[PDB]
Write a protein that binds this ligand. Sequence first.
Ligand code: HEM
Ligand code: HEM
Ligand SMILES: Cc1cc(N)nc(CCc2cncc([C@@H](CN)Cc3cc(C)cc(N)n3)c2)c1
Ligand SMILES: Cc1cc(N)nc(CCc2cncc([C@@H](CN)Cc3cc(C)cc(N)n3)c2)c1
Ligand SMILES: C[C@H](O)[C@H](O)[C@H]1CNc2nc(N)[nH]c(=O)c2N1
Ligand SMILES: C[C@H](O)[C@H](O)[C@H]1CNc2nc(N)[nH]c(=O)c2N1
Ligand SMILES: [Zn+2]
Lengths: 404, 405
Amino acid sequence: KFPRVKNWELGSITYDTLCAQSQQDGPCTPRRCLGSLVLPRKPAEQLLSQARDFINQYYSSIKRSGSQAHEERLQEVEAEVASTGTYHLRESELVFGAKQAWRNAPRCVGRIQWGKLQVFDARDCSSAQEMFTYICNHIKYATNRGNLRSAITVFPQRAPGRGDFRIWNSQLVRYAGYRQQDGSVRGDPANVEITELCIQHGWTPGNGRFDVLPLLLQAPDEAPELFVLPPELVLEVPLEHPTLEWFAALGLRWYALPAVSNMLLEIGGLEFSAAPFSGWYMSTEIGTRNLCDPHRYNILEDVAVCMDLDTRTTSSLWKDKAAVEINLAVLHSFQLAKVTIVDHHAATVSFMKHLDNEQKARGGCPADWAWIVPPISGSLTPVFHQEMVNYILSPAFRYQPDPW
Amino acid sequence: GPKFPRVKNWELGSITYDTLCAQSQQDGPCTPRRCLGSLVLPRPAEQLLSQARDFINQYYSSIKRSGSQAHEERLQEVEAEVASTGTYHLRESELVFGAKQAWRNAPRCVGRIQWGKLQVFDARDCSSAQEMFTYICNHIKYATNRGNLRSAITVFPQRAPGRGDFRIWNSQLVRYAGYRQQDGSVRGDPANVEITELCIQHGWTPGNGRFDVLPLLLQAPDEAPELFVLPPELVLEVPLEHPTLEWFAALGLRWYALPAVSNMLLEIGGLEFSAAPFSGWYMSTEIGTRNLCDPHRYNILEDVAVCMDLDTRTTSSLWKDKAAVEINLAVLHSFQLAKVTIVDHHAATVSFMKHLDNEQKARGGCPADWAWIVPPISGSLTPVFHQEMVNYILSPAFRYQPDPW
Ligand code: HEM
Ligand code: HEM
Ligand SMILES: Cc1cc(N)nc(CCc2cncc([C@@H](CN)Cc3cc(C)cc(N)n3)c2)c1
Ligand SMILES: Cc1cc(N)nc(CCc2cncc([C@@H](CN)Cc3cc(C)cc(N)n3)c2)c1
Ligand SMILES: C[C@H](O)[C@H](O)[C@H]1CNc2nc(N)[nH]c(=O)c2N1
Ligand SMILES: C[C@H](O)[C@H](O)[C@H]1CNc2nc(N)[nH]c(=O)c2N1
Ligand SMILES: [Zn+2]
């Protein structure tokens, strides 16, 4: 049965027929739904059918479905897998696969942009030093002085014989988190472990709240190497508020570039264990999650006290009021610094447009409602009222085990 | 590790495993192929006996008499009743247990810390629409308790072979009329357009205000539904004002005190109670965010933002967020002033986290629908946003049922 998908605000219904193209199981079963879980719990013919399916997707996308080029490409893949157990993508196929992985990413609210992705082929990378150069170019390109551009850099794929290329950091730009044996964390508590790893591999730590981490880059079967990002590469935006002057005094800042660097890109059965990608932020990621999460910088209380709100009682809605102001400060500060950012209303509106384009284009769109609805003001955005079907299509971005 | 769903709280870093899902006898809408967790409504003979046996086992476990002579006698008494009549009947204490358990089992209810404190009115002797009305009036008076709200359910006779059902036609005991206007817009609550027009068709003289309390359409078996007007002093409402924005009172907004769901089917041991209205107290975001701010409900966000002089021409001013917060504060403040029970979403979710811990120990899990439990504003400011949840159907249960018309 294809799911009927209703928008409860508008009363419109669609049917998702794209989900029939899914070949991998998600975590749910008829007995229990595990849709709110963040992470999953856990042969040549199998590779060949994913390869062929991907090759088919590619030629169908260039309208050449059945051309001489198509049949001879399938024959190449076949021959290469039969001989070697693996195969290699053409650059054009890689580009198409990377865009498709993004298009297919159920957790991404920014998929309206899926077609505009700069793909850097870094599969000719042979050392951690080279990965660093490619990463530097990526940041430079993606950052573009604040006029951010979506980009992905694709490092060599996994091979049966060897260790993976990996970037140990979960993002290219992350702030350190220094633990104190009196429990507390200075900086970003989300990055305590990668901070410790960096120090342990010989990084000299700072002691600030916003110390940019170096990269730990690992070439196959080698100790990772440490590479400090040149300060000039890392665009940061100090946070101010358009009307509250004390807000500046908070000393808050955030980096411009959200660049995920720990996910696996799977295309046609091939796996790219290092393929960092970046777009631009949606303000709530910074304002709400990174700054207000209790296990992140956790600044709600501080902002609320400065706003002189009654903090002694939840029913004064001090948290909500402070959150709004902090999100406002992020938007304003990014706008002032001329750095691309999207607010959650604009982003979700674009996502609804994306759902509509995809319905027409493919008969569905995999979407993870818990991730698409923003972390504040949920029902004030259109996506809250929109039913969504979540499923895994390939090419995909997948989580993978931490390399240590 | 353990062969059950692993459930993580990402704020605290703690893990639990849900073993309760093993008790689920009924498939939800998801498959390994695709998750439908976000859909609002996804699509007997020996069957009854098997559900009845299971329910009787639950009752006897809960009174710690499982395996006992009284337990085996009850089982036999149910089999005999079914064998000769096709149906059976619940003892009063079984109904009370079953109603509380249906609440406890309700995955979309964030208010379940209260599940043990539910007043069960047994209205299974009801035999006319007039009497349903008296019972409902009684329920409302009891539950409202002049603003000190008390959870209650009234259970009308179960569905029975051949004979028609008891149905309350209204989706809640208190609802505001929604009047379709000439221009196509709605005065009042757009949610209630259909029930409003049915009330008119069945002889109600409509008002034309934004907050007209609807009459009840009560259906006794095999009879046309009958119309009953709630005496006004029975329906407690709260005019809305804001603690600092003095003009907010001038908007003339109000909401009623008692959220009383009246169109769900209570299913206990295979028996089906098609009329079993239940009521708690509000969580403030239900009023302030959903009922007042949903674009397809009262849709007041823009009016309020304009009074607050916000910049409504750009999303990036966050005018919607600022106005929603102030509306939610007005709801909390106004109910507080009026001394009508209400719980804010921070307090509700904190208590639901406690509920989860309790149920982890009591039963090894708790079915929870994340999308419904996480409040509609400020979601990640609440502890439930960071809590993974496993959603599954247990019985006894409250279930949606089709409209009687
Ligand atoms: C262009 C601007 C973009 C915006 C505004 C955006 C928005 C978002 C947001 C808000 C999330 C949730 C992030 C979180 O909660 O931590 C996300 C997740 C994601 N997006 Fe994007 N996106 C953008 C570009 C991209 C690009 C270029 C890719 C890859 C090519 C991508 C793939 C993903 C993936 C794979 C996830 C899930 C990450 C995870 O599971 O941790 N997005 N997106
Ligand atoms: C005691 C105070 C209570 C609070 C604060 C509360 C809270 C809530 C909230 C916020 C919802 C979501 C409603 C929506 O989005 O429309 C809900 C749903 C629900 N609650 Fe409660 N609850 C309470 C008492 C009760 C009682 C007494 C029962 C039944 C005995 C109940 C059973 C339900 C059910 C079945 C739903 C799902 C309704 C649906 O799907 O439409 N709860 N609860
Ligand atoms: C490309 C892009 C654009 C944009 N606007 N935002 C992003 C952010 C992606 C992201 C960054 N850190 C963390 C996450 C988290 C959950 N918030 C997902 C996650 C979970 C776990 C267990 C590990 C991990 N590395 N990542 C996601 C990426
Ligand atoms: C007992 C109780 C306490 C409390 N605080 N709140 C409630 C509210 C219940 C409720 C009130 N209106 C509407 C709903 C809607 C979805 N928001 C659920 C729903 C959807 C549909 C399609 C049908 C139906 N009967 N019910 C649920 C009930
Ligand atoms: C437990 C829950 O799934 C988890 O907190 C999710 C909820 N929704 C999210 N949505 C986004 N965009 N990012 C997140 O990290 C999360 N976290
Ligand atoms: C599409 C989506 O399931 C729908 O809008 C849900 C989301 N979460 C909800 N949560 C609650 N508590 N109540 C609701 O009516 C809804 N609506
Ligand atoms: Zn699911």
